[PDB]
Design a protein around this ligand. Structure first.
Ligand SMILES: [Cl-]
Ligand SMILES: [Cl-]
Ligand SMILES: [Cl-]
Length: 163
């Protein structure tokens, strides 16, 4: 584990992360997709062999020895708010189990269900709160990746408030 487990946020492409493993914001079918998923496909295409997995789950596939944890958040266009909330919390719990199993000291993670699966709603606080609920009991250094300047400030504020 990390000597003093922390949370940090960076505004940049997660395909350029400096962590021991990455979480992909995957679709259930293991397709190249869009947004984070397409960037992950371009950087680690080998990790998409048999990566299909249901909503609310995570499946890790190695690219060389680098682990890519495919985490499938719900598409809020299809789920109700209550069911989508439950599946989003479940996807993050599965990410925590995989990060623990892998023995890594750091992980790069995006906010699941905040892009094209958001159903057109701002889900920063909802998604980040489920990320903290799952990851708080792990000892890996967590680095959250985002692309928007206002989101970077809000995520940074949420991390700092708890310290
Ligand atoms: Cl970048
Ligand atoms: Cl998304
Ligand atoms: Cl963002």
């Amino acid at each position: 584990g990390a000597m003093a487990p922390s949370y940090r946020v960076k505004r940049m492409d997660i395909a350029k992360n400096d962590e021991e493993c990455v979480v992909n914001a995957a679709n259930p079918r293991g397709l190249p997709g869009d947004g984070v998923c397409k960037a992950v496909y371009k950087k680690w295409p080998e990790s998409f062999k048999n990566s299909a997995t249901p909503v609310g789950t995570a499946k890790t596939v190695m690219c060389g020895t680098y682990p890519v944890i495919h985490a499938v958040g719900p598409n809020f266009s299809n789920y109700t708010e209550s069911e989508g909330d439950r599946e989003l919390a479940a996807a993050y719990r599965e990410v925590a189990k995989e990060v623990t199993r892998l023995g890594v000291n750091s992980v790069a993670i995006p906010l699941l269900s905040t892009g094209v699966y958001s159903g057109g709603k701002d889900r920063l606080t909802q998604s980040l709160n489920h990320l903290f609920t799952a990851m708080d009991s792990t000892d890996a250094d967590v680095v959250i990746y985002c692309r928007d300047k206002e989101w970077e400030k809000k995520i940074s504020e949420a991390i700092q408030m708890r310290t």
